[PDB]
């Protein structure tokens, strides 16, 4: 509408973490294998 | 190199010579300006010019002239490189930028903003333009197509149209034969429109036109060159019955008072 | 509703978190903190994925109720963009 | 689908209008409805769209007059992708509604001259109103118009272009005046009274007093349906429990005491 | 250098004045003369100047948008809007010492004139909320197709805008006034058009008719008058056709 | 330190009044014709003021539009505001303790005047998301060419605010009104240009040039003198041949 | 606490203002380019139980409507809990200035704040009702201007129970000479002047032939201009600085 600039207040590049999260939800039974694989590496998750 | 004659109708008058002149001027890529009949026929002239232009020459970019009050029009004409100009913050190409090597079918809307015409003067100055917030200018090439519906010299004298706007444009003027002046293919164009309307309505047979209808059409002013006549034919077909006694009953237009 | 048995669930190791918080070694504490951050990101991602799948399924059912009830004959012609419109996610998330 | 003519005008003029609408329903062209304030024009257009061969997909009766700005109406006609920021609604949806459908507008005289020109340009080509950085889409859409103001009056005013007025006006539907219609008015009033007695779930229908009916007929009632429904509601609020035929008209909120 | 010249005594005097003013980076307001002042001449003058070695660049004054004028002076500002976050310099700052040729000067807004003349006369490159403005001495020159004193009498242009000119307003003679190389210029334009019209040469020509066509109003521009030759050549479309009994009146309807 | 082009008895009185003006940051207003250059004299006085080494603000007011004080004047150091995440400086805030000269404050928005009313009345008004502002120690200065006496009568500015904006307003006499030392200024400009144009020496002005300068209207006053100097640079001719007369007229035809 | 010229009508008005000061009722004030009751408003806040209470005085002209509700306890999407307009003024004096030229959106916000409305912003769903004593001033617009449709009628109804009338400086100027002398002494201390050389009684009477459009502001400006013109304290001044915007 009327031309202007920012006069009041109101995105993201998902990295490898959120990128693999998006790469997740591909399957469920297969997702369990990857989750077990991650839980093996992560020592603070049960 | 294709015909694409389309619905090129009403050439029995000197419009055949106008089409010959248009064909002669078609190879040139210089500025193209016309004077369409007020109310009808400018779109047909533009389509004929586009057919005259090579099909592979480029896209036929058509814009209806508008004032500069809408900043969107300014972004379309000059471009939009910086943010908050048009589209995304990136270099969203404008309408002029959208046309690269194609026809720029201008409209003689006689828009109130002379500033818009002044900006368009730079659009065709050396074949270059700069987007809104454009860090570097861009030299572009495109064909130009224009038309008219009023007396350009009258506006030039009255100051309604910029003198430089007329000077830069209008390499040659193409005049459309008026409906009150053409008057030649009225029977032929009327028959073509009637056939098309009958096909659309799935009419079993051609109803035919009485001689009184032809006399009335001759007496008719016909403000629109090829659209008002077609609209009148459609209205008559709506109020008539094909190959039946209702064929005599012809309706000029619903705007006219009912019989 | 999502199948409760099928949905995987992860729990943060409270003993490990307590050990890392009170870890005498600074390097061990930093490693524990990094692992906790990664695990929290993974858990949040899994929960969000499950919730998004549930919402997408609900939206799909909203428009496919005709096929669900009447049968395959009363299947509405639907596209990925049709489902994407009813939700805030993109067609890529739909795929 | 099938046209709905509930409480159709008993006047033969209404029947002739319906016959013309049935004749034009197989056809696909714009229509102009010369209506009045609450005359029932838009409902007639909706009934025609129902009778307009198929159901004709989406049917939208958006009015440019009842819009905050002409720019909003233009955005409804077509929204350029990425133009400005944010919106009260998905503007391209209004354009998509006409796709596989028709175009219906109310009080078209209020449309801006630039908006009218954009619409005239769109209608001849059929393409989308806003390019949005891409070639506009030519959706197969019909059209319909309904303005109380006279088209020749607008032409004299010059707000609408000659081509706009000509190509826009393909069919004319002159709504009979509500005050002029008497038998149709009585039939519609009886139908509305029956419908209200059913919907309000009143155990017994009060009916209508002869004096009350005469007073209602004496009223100008420009709103053939809108004012009729308002007066029906005014009488219903003064519920006489099927025993009071006074039918007091409290439709005017300003009127009191 | 590359641009063709009028090759007239008045044209020679104008070229000599341009050469004298070439080393000067001061502002110029050479009269646009309503289409008769070849912008290519100004470009060649900038080429002669050291601004050719610098970043010489021009722009149209009236091209800018009303709400972005401050941006137009200073480019994209980093803090102007949420999306763009970069202190992009202005077009003048994109030149920053080059030759800035101002076109559409008479069409600039009153507020635009008040901002631009004030900034140019004195002031440094200050963006939206900048820390410290940066002074960039950029060579300037302006064009005005109309009479600036007429605007001053009308008051449309500011007196500061009148003083913004630092060099003498070079004015080109009108086509009716100059009319010196009309034969040679017409021959050059005809050769260029024949090359453009894929015509090797014109077997028919008439110098008397060319002189008669020179004896015309030639309104709009001298280049506009030359375009009449191209229009006539295109209409004839033939080589063995003398220039005699040939008049280019595209606006006029033929009988 | 402070180079001065004006050496007159009235100029001497004005300079003494400047000496009579101390760094009180009072709402004094320097009034002069177009090209008066009184802003330079005000900057020289600010250098001579208590803040011998202090900040100075040019602050071309015409560049401000649809922007509050916290946009460029006060600044937006707060984050998460309208736009991206950053902290912006403020010209008025940064000028605290220095000099804040208003460039052509006559051409200002009505809302700008409304804000400046409180800004000058209190001195601690604006804040980008702040509760209590801090009073600025800057020195308020201003200079333009319009006559506020009629603008206030016309309602262009708030009479109460303008009166509060006026404390020791001083009007500089025009150079045309002065009509003295024009020959000395011309000689100084000739020397400066000969240095600039690398000329051997000033050609010299005969009695005809002196009479023309005396008879010159000089509506621009000092601006007219600068324009005449630029023309004489253009009209330098030969250093050996003294310039009998030197004239300039933007619309004067060459013949 | 507050220093001003004393007049009998002004003394009675000040006494009434002090009496109303302990009351926390909303205040709407009209000024005549003099003190403008701003000093009177501060003295009223000091005399009230809100002496230690907040005395936020917002000059409502420089804000942007896009954040107007943000100013009046509005926060949205990183840092939150920003002090609102009433929140920062809660528990004490809440003064509004520059009200003559405020936007109509500000008028609607004030109408909402008349019943104290509520501030359900993303930063906080506060019910407002801070109960702090409201006060309004800078009513440059005449009552006819309000009747001219400039402001909402409800806001005028929502205004204070009474109106603070201000008389012109021309109406009472008996102590104007004393105030001018005090201002001259203050400026001499500020200008590091040795001492006041005095004033000519004939020149003082000649200067008295003025309407004082700026009232105390005009008196102070005239005194400052005359002192600057004198530039010395050898002999008493015998001239009047009629106007800085006067040709000479
Ligand atoms: N031979 C023809 N072929 C196709 N269309 C024609 C022909 N003759 C007339 N027309 C019609 O005439 C109309 C001219 O309209 P147009 O010139 O665009 O109106 P305006 O001049 O008012 O802008 C077109 O819509 C076109 O359908
Ligand atoms: N023939 C009819 N039968 C039953 N109801 C009708 C008829 N014509 C109009 N109405 C009623 O009149 C009401 C208003 O119609 P209309 O005036 O066309 O709408 P709008 O206010 O959009 O113009 C509708 O709700 C409709 O139910
Ligand atoms: N000597 C020349 N030779 C060829 N073309 C010229 C010559 N002089 C001017 N032109 C043409 O004139 C056009 C520019 O017009 P110009 O005189 O610059 O208008 P304005 O005076 O408004 O700037 C250019 O496109 C250029 O081709
Ligand atoms: N004291 C002075 N001595 C010599 N030249 C001066 C003096 N003051 C101003 N000028 C001339 O005035 C011009 C700039 O004036 P300007 O700053 O536009 O006046 P204003 O203060 O009215 O804006 C300079 O080119 C300069 O040559
Ligand atoms: N009784 C007084 N004692 C001391 N100073 C006063 C008195 N009355 C007015 N003034 C001075 O007059 C000035 C008027 O300022 P302000 O209240 O902003 O005027 P307005 O009401 O027109 O906005 C103040 O700065 C103040 O110093
Ligand atoms: Mg309706
Ligand atoms: Mg058209
Ligand atoms: Mg030009
Ligand atoms: Mg100046
Ligand atoms: Mg005040």
Numbering used by the authors:
A (entry chain M): 1 to 10, 13 to 48
B (entry chain 4): 1 to 259
C (entry chain M): 288 to 382
D (entry chain 5): 2 to 258
E (entry chain 3), F (entry chain 2): 5 to 259
G (entry chain 1): 6 to 82, 88 to 258
Task: Reproduce passages from the article.
To understand the structural basis and how DNA is stabilized in these complexes, we determined the structures of PspF1-275-RNAP-σ54-DNA containing mismatches between −11 and −8 [RPi(−11/−8)] and between −10 and −1 [RPi(−10/−1)]. Interestingly, DNA with a partially opened bubble between −11 and −8 did not support transcription, suggesting that this complex is unable to proceed further to an open complex. In the RPi(−11/−8), we observe multiple structural conformations, at varying degrees of tilt of PspF1-275 hexamer ring relative to RNAP-σ54 and varying degrees of RNAP clamp opening We also observe significant degrees of promoter DNA bending, demonstrating the wide degree of conformational flexibility in the complex. The DNA density downstream of −10 was generally poorly resolved, indicating that this region was highly flexible. However, one conformation has sufficiently high resolution to allow us to resolve the DNA. In these complexes, we observe a previously unreported interaction between PspF and σ54 RpoN domain. This interaction is only possible with the tilted ring conformation, suggesting this interaction contributes to the stabilization of this ring conformation in both RPi(−11/−8) and RPi(−10/−1), giving rise to the higher-resolution reconstruction of these conformations. Significantly, we observe the σ54 N terminus is further shifted along the PspF hexamer in RPi(−11/−8) and RPi(−10/−1) compared to that of RPi(−12/−11). This would thus support the mechanistic model in which we proposed that ATP hydrolysis and the conformational changes within the hexamer lead to translocation of the σ54 N terminus; and RPi(−11/−8) and RPi(−10/−1) are further along the transcription initiation pathway. Second, PspF1-275 hexamer ring tilts, as observed in RPi(−11/−8) and RPi(−10/−1) structures, altering interactions between PspF1-275 and DNA, which could contribute to or stabilize DNA melting.
Bacteria use sigma (σ) factors to recruit RNA polymerase (RNAP) to promoter regions of genes that need to be transcribed, with 60% bacteria containing at least one specialized σ factor, σ54, responsible for transcribing many stress response genes. The σ54-mediated transcription initiation requires specific AAA+ proteins (ATPases Associated with diverse cellular Activities) known as bacterial enhancer-binding proteins (bEBPs). DNA looping enables bEBP hexamers to engage and actively remodel the RNAP-σ54-DNA closed complex to convert it into an open complex. In this work we capture intermediate states of bEBPs in facilitating DNA opening and partial unfolding of σ54, and therefore link the ATPase activity to DNA opening and σ54 remodeling, which eventually lead to transcription activation.
